[PDB]
Amino acid sequence: MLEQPYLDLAKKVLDEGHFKPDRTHTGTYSIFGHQMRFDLSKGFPLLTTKKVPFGLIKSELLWFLHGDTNIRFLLQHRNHIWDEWAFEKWVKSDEYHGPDMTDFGHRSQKDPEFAAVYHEEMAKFDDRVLHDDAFAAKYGDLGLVYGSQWRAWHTSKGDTIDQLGDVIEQIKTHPYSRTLIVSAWNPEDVPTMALPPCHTLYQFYVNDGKLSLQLYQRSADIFLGVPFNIASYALLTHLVAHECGLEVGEFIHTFGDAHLYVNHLDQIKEQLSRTPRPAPTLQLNPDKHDIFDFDMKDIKLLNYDPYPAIKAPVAV
Amino acid sequence: MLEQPYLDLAKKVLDEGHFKPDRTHTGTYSIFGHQMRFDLSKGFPLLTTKKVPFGLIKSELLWFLHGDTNIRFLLQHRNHIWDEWAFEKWVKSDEYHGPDMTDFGHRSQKDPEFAAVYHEEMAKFDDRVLHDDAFAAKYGDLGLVYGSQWRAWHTSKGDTIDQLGDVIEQIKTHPYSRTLIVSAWNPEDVPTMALPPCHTLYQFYVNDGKLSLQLYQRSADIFLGVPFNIASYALLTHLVAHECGLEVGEFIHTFGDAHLYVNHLDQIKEQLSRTPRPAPTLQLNPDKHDIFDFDMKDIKLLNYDPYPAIKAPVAV
Structure with missing residues (x-):
């Protein structure tokens, strides 16, 4: 075929x-x-x-x-294929305030309770990018x-x-x-x-x-x-x-x-x-x-x- | 094989x-x-x-x-594979003084007597590039x-x-x-x-x-x-x-x-x-x-x- x-x-x-x-x-x-x-x-x-x-x-x-x-267009279409990239950038910044999230990639696939704390930070990030124009402009842009x-x-x-x-x-x-x-x-x-x-x-x-x-x-x-x-x-x-x-x-x-x-x-x-x-x-x-x-x-x-x-x- | x-x-x-x-x-x-x-x-x-x-x-x-x-290194090795490129540039310039050479590519394969006048201009160009340092610097450089x-x-x-x-x-x-x-x-x-x-x-x-x-x-x-x-x-x-x-x-x-x-x-x-x-x-x-x-x-x-x-x- x-x-x-x-x-x-x-x-x-x-x-x-x-x-x-x-x-x-x-x-x-x-x-x-x-x-x-x-x-x-x-x-x-x-x-x-x-x-x-x-x-x-x-x-x-x-x-x-x-x-x-900018991730914003994708999120609006329920497409999270690139969130990881934008998120990484948000996490590794001066303005970031929350759990270390360091190496959130493996840690989610290994730790069950981390996969929910990380899954949360991300959940918020996606909303902030969707609703905060200056945020989307700074963290939602992959470049x-x-x-x-x-x-x-x-x-x-x-x-x-x-x-x-x-x-x-x-x-x-x-x-x-x-x-x-x-x-x-x-x-x-x-x-x-x-x-x-x-x-x-x-x-x-x-x-x-x-x-x-x-x-x-x-x-x-x-x-x-x-x-x-x-x-x-x-x-x-x-x-x-x-x-x-x-x-x-x-x-x-x-x-x-x-x-x-x-x-x-x-x-x-x-x-x-x-x-x-x-x-x-x-x-x-x-x-x-x-x-x-x-x-x-x-x-x-x-x-x-x-x-x-x-x-x-x-x-x- | x-x-x-x-x-x-x-x-x-x-x-x-x-x-x-x-x-x-x-x-x-x-x-x-x-x-x-x-x-x-x-x-x-x-x-x-x-x-x-x-x-x-x-x-x-x-x-x-x-x-x-720069063509000069090639010419020194009897390698004329790129002469056409340098030559073109020489021919299409203010400093060029000789036969039109316009479209020397086909004209050589079509005209017998042109294939010898063009073959000459090129023959000189290669020598000038080989011996005139300022020339090689200007026309021998393909960029x-x-x-x-x-x-x-x-x-x-x-x-x-x-x-x-x-x-x-x-x-x-x-x-x-x-x-x-x-x-x-x-x-x-x-x-x-x-x-x-x-x-x-x-x-x-x-x-x-x-x-x-x-x-x-x-x-x-x-x-x-x-x-x-x-x-x-x-x-x-x-x-x-x-x-x-x-x-x-x-x-x-x-x-x-x-x-x-x-x-x-x-x-x-x-x-x-x-x-x-x-x-x-x-x-x-x-x-x-x-x-x-x-x-x-x-x-x-x-x-x-x-x-x-x-x-x-x-x-x-």
């Missing part, structure tokens, strides 16, 4: 990947260099062998597309995340570049261009960053009136990360094609270090028991075309009929 | 690539997204099915490694080429970053790092550039005491470009491993738009008739280890036993 490459990637790292230690200190089985391709005319690559929350991938892409870098890298690359001349906006203009006037690239990797920021981007860069390609996109992901969590990643960029490929009056081609996913954290083996093994169901269909608002002013309601996913979700521990 | 992936890439674009128009206006048969991998413990991937001048790949890599951006992108990335704070030097330090102290990346793509320069880099970025990977490298090439000329490209980065993988006291792993070559210009079909077809000979062996100076102070003599290629070279027209 449509998602078979993903299952094949998991099987391969399972019986071919070598043990490799990592940053988090949760071992991994890793492979270097892999490539999968999805034919988007065959359907949307949202995995049917595990329930994946499209709502979260949709509102995160829109946040990127608006060149927004260097995909939204600004894509739409506001800061130049040495002090200005700001809209790579994505520019490339889309280039797809419209020079379809056969071999330089339709958007990068998220800035050598001057990366060495200080908390999370240097995993989605390093992407390239568009146009031929026979069909738009294709290739993504270079430097590091990937096969079980938890990849199911989301495939959907974000397959969606992005669709949006850009809608605006450019193009048909959709393939989404090619290239990998640097593709890995399976050692505490996800039982879960990935179980998923491999399931049998892929037909793939859902993506439907976009035909009346609206300016994808930067697109909103949650402009994108619908039809026929997603997944298997139950599989819980697994976040590699801390 | 060791080079089979290259021959397989050519066959595939031959009977699977679709016709796609390009910048040069010399049609191409193109594919988007491909990946080949070379096991460097099996030998050096210098093609045996066509004679490829390793001397030119060796002195071009060293020029990059020194963070040099933004791999040497400065790798070793002198200009920051917005006015400084200069040595990505390559820094990453090598990171390979030594954090082998299992998933951020060992060197980028050549700067969003602020690229939109003005003559040749935005083809070799967008590369990533190192270390496991089981072996160093691997993956390259993302956005555009590739399968017949003329790729044979060189494979060798430059396979060599780079060896040099870095030598310095880091690591063994050599694989060189993974990833492609955006891989293409065959329409006027190279007869040549590529002929090469496909040849039968790969065993691969040469690379030998580096065991006494010297600082690869930035490496010189032509520190690197030897043993047993290269190729087929005759195949001439083909440079797509102008």
